[PDB]
Amino acid sequence: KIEEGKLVIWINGDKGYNGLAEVGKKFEKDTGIKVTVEHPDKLEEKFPQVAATGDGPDIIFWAHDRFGGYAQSGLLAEITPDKAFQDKLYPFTWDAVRYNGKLIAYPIAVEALSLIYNKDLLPNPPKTWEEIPALDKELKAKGKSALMFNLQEPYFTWPLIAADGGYAFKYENGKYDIKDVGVDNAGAKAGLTFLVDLIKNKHMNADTDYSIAEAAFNKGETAMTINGPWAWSNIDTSKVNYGVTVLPTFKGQPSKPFVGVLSAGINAASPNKELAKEFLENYLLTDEGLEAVNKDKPLGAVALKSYEEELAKDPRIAATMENAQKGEIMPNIPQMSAFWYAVRTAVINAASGRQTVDAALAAAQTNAAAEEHVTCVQSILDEFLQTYGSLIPLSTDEVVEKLEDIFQQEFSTPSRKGLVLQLIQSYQRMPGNAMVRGFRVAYKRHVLTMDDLGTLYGQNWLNDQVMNMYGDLVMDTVPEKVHFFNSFFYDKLRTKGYDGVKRWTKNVDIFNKELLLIPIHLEVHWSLISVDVRRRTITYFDSQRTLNRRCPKHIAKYLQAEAVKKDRLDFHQGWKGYFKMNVARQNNDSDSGAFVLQYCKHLALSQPFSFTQQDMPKLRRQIYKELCHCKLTV
Amino acid sequence: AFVHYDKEEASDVEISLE
Ligand SMILES: OC[C@H]1O[C@H](O[C@H]2[C@H](O)[C@@H](O)[C@@H](O[C@H]3[C@H](O)[C@@H](O)[C@@H](O[C@H]4[C@H](O)[C@@H](O)[C@@H](O)O[C@@H]4CO)O[C@@H]3CO)O[C@@H]2CO)[C@H](O)[C@@H](O)[C@@H]1O
Ligand code: NA
C-alpha cells in the first residue's frame, strides 16, 4: 500500500525526472518530507491496476488524454485550488483537466510535435510532405537520409493522417460523439498511404522507433526528425545545430498534431493528498520549479503564465505553439485510450506489409468505437484465462463486481447482471476461449495440466494428481502439525503390509505430528482416514456413511509397525477406531473426492466450518483456485 | 467387508481394530 508521510511520483522517462527530483529535494529541505521520483515503463497502464487496490504513487504525471479513464474509475481525487491559484494558469489548460465538471489534475505544460531539422545539412527545410521523397534521393547520394522519426507510436504519425481530414471523435455541439470516428475516411487513408509509400520507396524504415531516430538525428546522419520539446536538451549536447519549424503540409493542408497537456493528478487512495497539494502548487508550479524541470528536459509552453511569458520569447517554443494551433487538442474521454491502441496496430501492420491501408484502418475504425463495457469484459475474461487456464472456476458475480469497480456504475440489478452474463456466454462460445493450450501449474514436484484441472468441472471424478497436490497444500499450510500420505500409500499397505510402505516416511517422524491424513481410493469412490496422533485414534470418513472395516485395521497395523521401526514405542499402544458421524454426506456418486479434500482442509485448520452436497459447485471452483494459487483460502 | 449406517448416531462409533 501507499506509505504516509512520503510523496512518491510517477513520470515518464522522456521528461526531466532528475530536474523534478531537485524540486523534491527542496521540498524535503523545507518540510522534512522525502520525495521519491520514479519512471516505470508502461506506467500509464500500471496506474489503474495498482490504484484500484490502494497501492501506487501519490502523484501521477501524463498527458491529459488518459485521465478521463482514471476519473471514470474513481482513481483521481478532486483538485481544490484557490480561485487565486487558478488565475495563475492559462484557462484552456484547466479545460484539459476538467472531466464532467470536476478538476482531476493540475495542468503543467503543453506539448506539440514540430519539425526539427539540421541547419547545416538542410538550411532551408521542406514546407510540404510531397517534396521530401526527392530530397531523400538528393541526400542519400551525399550519404545521408532525409527524415527519421518514431514509427512505433501513432502520436508521431498522426499529424499526417489528420492533415487531409483524419480525426478521432467528432466534436459537435460541445460533446464528443464516440460513435463518429474518423480513422478510415479517405483523408486518413490518404495520409497513411503516403507514409507506407515512403516505406516501400526505402525513404524510411518501418522498424524505426524513438531511440533509433534520436540517434540518427543527433549524430548528423539524417537531416530531419519529428519530436516534442523534451527532445531539445539532448540535441543541445550533440554535434547538431538545429532549428524548430512548422511541420510540412500534406495536400496543401497543415499537419494536425494531437496536443497534449502534461498533467499531474493525485491518487485517490493517497493518505498524503494535502502534501501533494502543497508540493504541486507551491514548489512545482513556480517559476523556480518549472525552471528545474525545463532545464533537464523541456516542458514546452508552461501553464504558469508568469514563467511562460519569460519562456515565450524562444523561437522553439514559438514553433511548438504554431504547430499546436494548426492541430487539435486531444480529448480526455475514456475512449481515447481505446482510440490510440486501435491506431497503433493499424500503422504498424500497414507499414510492415502484413495489412493494407484500407484493411488496417477498417480494423481500427471498428475498435476505436467499440462499446467500452464489451471490451472491458473481453479483457477481464482474457486475464482470467491466462491466470487459471479456463473459465471453470469463474463466478458471474465476480465479473459483475469488477465492472462495478471500473465504471463506478451498478451492474447487479437484473437488467444489467443479465447483460453481463450474455457477454460472458458470447466470450465462451468463441473458439480458443475455452482453455489455454499448455497451461501448467507447478508446486514442488507436483504438476497439473488442463487435463487435471478439468476433473474439477461439473461432476467429473477428481483424479489422483489433483487430490495429491491439494493434500500437499493442506499439509504445507500447517506442516509442523499435519502430514499427508498420498493416494498410492493405501493400495501398497493393503497388499504388501508394512513391508510395502516401510520406506514411505523418508525422514518424517509421524509421531511428532498431531494429525495424519490418508485418502482411500477404491474404484471411483474416495474415502479418508484421520489419525489423531495425540489422542491415538484412527477415524474413517465416508461421504456415503459406509464403513470400510478392513481399512482402519490396516492403518493400525501400519502405525504399530512404524512405532517399532522408528524407536517411538511410546506411541505403540492405545489406538481405538471410529466411524465418523455428523459430517457432510453426498447424494450423487461423483463428488466424493471433493468431500474428502474439504474434510482434510477443515481437520487441519480447525476453524468453524460446515458444508453440504449443495455447496459442492462453489467448493469445486474454490479448490481449482487454491490449486492455481498454491495457497489455501484462509 | 463394508457396513452401511442408516442414521447419524450421536457420537462417533467405536469399531474394532483387530
Ligand atoms: O500495447 C501497446 C503499447 O501500450 C502502451 O502505449 C499506449 C498508451 O498506454 C496510451 O496512453 C496511448 O499513448 C498515447 C498517450 O496517451 C499520449 O499522451 C501520447 O503520448 C505522447 C505524449 O503526449 C508525450 O508526453 C510523450 O510522452 O510522447 C508520447 C508519445 O509516445 O500518445 C501516445 C500514443 O502514441 O497509446 C499507447 C499505444 O499506442 C505502452 O505504453 C506501450 O509500451 C505498449 O507497447
Ligand atoms: Na533525464
Author numbering:
A (entry chain A): 1 to 370, 1311 to 1574
B (entry chain B): 764 to 781
Q: What are the paper's exact sentences on this?
A:
The rixosome is a large multisubunit complex that initiates RNA decay during critical nuclear transactions including ribosome assembly and heterochromatin maintenance. The rixosome is composed of at least six protein subunits including three structural subunits (PELP1, WDR18, and TEX10) and three enzymatic subunits (LAS1L, NOL9, and SENP3) but the overall architecture and stoichiometry of the full complex remains undefined. The central scaffold and namesake of the rixosome is PELP1 (Rix1 in Saccharomyces cerevisiae), a large 120-kDa protein that is enriched in proline, glutamic acid, and leucine residues and is a well characterized proto-oncogene whose expression is dysregulated in many human cancers. In addition to RNase PNK, the other enzymatic module of the rixosome is SENP3, a SUMO-specific protease.
To understand the structural basis for SENP3 and PELP1 association, we determined the x-ray crystal structure of the SENP3 SUMO protease domain bound to a fragment of the PELP1 IDR. Because we could not obtain suitable crystals with SENP3 on its own, we created a fixed-arm MBP-SENP3 catalytic domain fusion construct (MBP-SENP3311–574) containing a mutation at the active site cysteine (C532S). We obtained crystals of MBP-SENP3311–574 C532S grown in the presence of excess sPELP1 peptide. (D) X-ray crystal structure of the SENP3 protease domain (311 to 574aa, dark blue) C532S mutant bound to the PELP1SLiM peptide (764 to 781aa, teal) at 2.93 Å resolution. While predicted to be largely disordered, two small segments of the PELP1 IDR form β-strands upon binding to SENP3. Residues 776 to 778 containing a well-conserved VEI motif from PELP1 form an antiparallel β-strand interface with the last β-strand (β7) from SENP3’s mixed β-sheet. Residues 765 to 767 containing a conserved FVH motif also form an antiparallel β-strand with another β-strand from SENP3. Loss of the VEI motif prevents the association of PELP1 and SENP3, while loss of the FVH motif did not prevent binding. The PELP1SLiM does not bind directly to the SENP3 active site; therefore, we propose that PELP1 is an allosteric regulator of SENP3. On its own, the SUMO protease domain of SENP3 is unstable and it relies on engagement of the PELP1SLiM for allosteric activation.
